[PDB]
Amino acid sequence: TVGAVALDLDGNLAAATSTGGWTNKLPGRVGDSPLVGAGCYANNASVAVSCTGTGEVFIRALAAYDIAALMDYGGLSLAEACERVVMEKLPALGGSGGLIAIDHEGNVALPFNTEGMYRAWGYAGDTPTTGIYRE
Amino acid sequence: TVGAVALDLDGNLAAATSTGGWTNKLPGRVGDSPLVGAGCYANNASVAVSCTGTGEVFIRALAAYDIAALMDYGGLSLAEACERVVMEKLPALGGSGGLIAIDHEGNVALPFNTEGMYRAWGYAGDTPTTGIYR
Amino acid sequence: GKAVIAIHGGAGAISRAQMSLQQELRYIEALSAIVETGQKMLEAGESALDVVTEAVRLLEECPLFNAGIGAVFTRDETHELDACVMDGNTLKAGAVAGVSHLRNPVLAARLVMEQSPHVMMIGEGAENFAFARGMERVSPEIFSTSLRYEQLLAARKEG
Amino acid sequence: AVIAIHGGAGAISRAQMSLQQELRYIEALSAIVETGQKMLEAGESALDVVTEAVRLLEECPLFNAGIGAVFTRDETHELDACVMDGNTLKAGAVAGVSHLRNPVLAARLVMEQSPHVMMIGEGAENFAFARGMERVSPEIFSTSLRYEQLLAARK
Ligand SMILES: [Cl-]
Ligand SMILES: [Cl-]
Ligand SMILES: [Cl-]
Ligand code: NA
Ligand code: NA
Ligand code: NA
């Protein structure tokens, strides 16, 4: 699982997710990566999200869309929505992983409940930030 | 496409959807029916939904989950959420079809924006209601 | 709330001008029989999961409806079937897409839910999972109906 | 304007990984996010930026997508991808593909050149090939690192 989210100069949001699945996977099993609203979602009016983790839990919890709906309908900020999904709801179903998100206001979040998540972000015309481990 | 939603005496919701897709479909195309939150969703906290319609729009709209999220987070009634998704949001994206939904209080909705939808529902120990047209 | 079931057999351009009452009652009778089965099961204390599974299984069996027996034809004059089931109690789900050799995709979806750590399986992988758990292999021809074959022909040119 | 990328979440420990090992990932993430930043700075679309970032993460054998995909039980590769455009709410996705070098470009193709969101398996592949995408052998994805991780995971 790899992914990208972006907000362009025109205010467009976009998300993309790509994966090889998981080591020793049986044939024809599908996780969250190719599923709209589970592993990948974008709407100019809310957020762009790409996910990575226990596929079945990201599907059951519709993780990517749940970020948008918690913000849109629940009035949560991006930070609050990410905390709710990644640190509460995913573990509640036995689910490990993380996600990257940008909202329409340019807030960026890279929540994960795992030992690490390969990640990076940067604003245009700024130095990028990278990370592997927690805090 | 076919589906069923139900609430049982223990207060559990469930949803199931099944399809052969669309006449003259090219191989390997997947619509909303097998996709959680698109053609099928159930949560004891909100609603059970089974959809039928333009698969591409029901996926892009996360039609089934959007009903649940409008009720759970937005505090919309089942009727209001069904109106919003089926009569407003889906048509705005070029999607025709409908859905069946039961909430955790046993409210039932069978919204559709098409000419017809083969549908029926009934309370346990009651006579069933059947329909095709508006 | 009172235990309750709803079913659908698909939404589309259905108009009164197109059918007789006797032709309508064929659809009404099928929907009534299946919803009545669900109602009786709910009244006897059966689970919402077991009721929707059986209701969709019956809708698959019913040739009038575009799932299982009575599936529409693909471009290639075969059948590709998809199904999902979700349990609101556990939030477990199971789903199969693109299967042609399973009589009842909803039962295969329910097998994915109950007898795997995965939500979604596709094509031959989904089929082989189902066969390894003892579900019967079928010819895709079993789904084929004159009604749907005629719809395929009216929708295209011959050559 | 802003980009964020990931190359997967899970049980990364420090006691197992050297600094030179870690720096290869840091340098890889750096170059890709920087490529994205420069595209955004130049006024390229969010869609084109996430497509190119994920294409680069696919090409990079360090990340479990495209080249450097994990091995299945049967010691081959099955790849999945999705792309969504927030401007149109259009989306494209492929699942279970073995003969497409860059699943995210296949997904973008489903988005733009089909009325569908999602294609699977040989239907997805034949759809892409019918629009001039190259057929590849899944052997191109295979790496020693991921083979070694398959043998380890079997224990
Ligand atoms: Cl770090
Ligand atoms: Cl971990
Ligand atoms: Cl060093
Ligand atoms: Na049928
Ligand atoms: Na790669
Ligand atoms: Na092959």
UniProtKB/Swiss-Prot annotation, chain B:
Residues annotated for substrate binding in this entry: 29-32, 52-55
Active-site residues, Swiss-Prot/TrEMBL? 1
Q: Which domain of life is it from?
A: Bacteria
Name assigned to this protein = Isoaspartyl peptidase subunit beta
Species of origin reads Escherichia coli (strain K12)
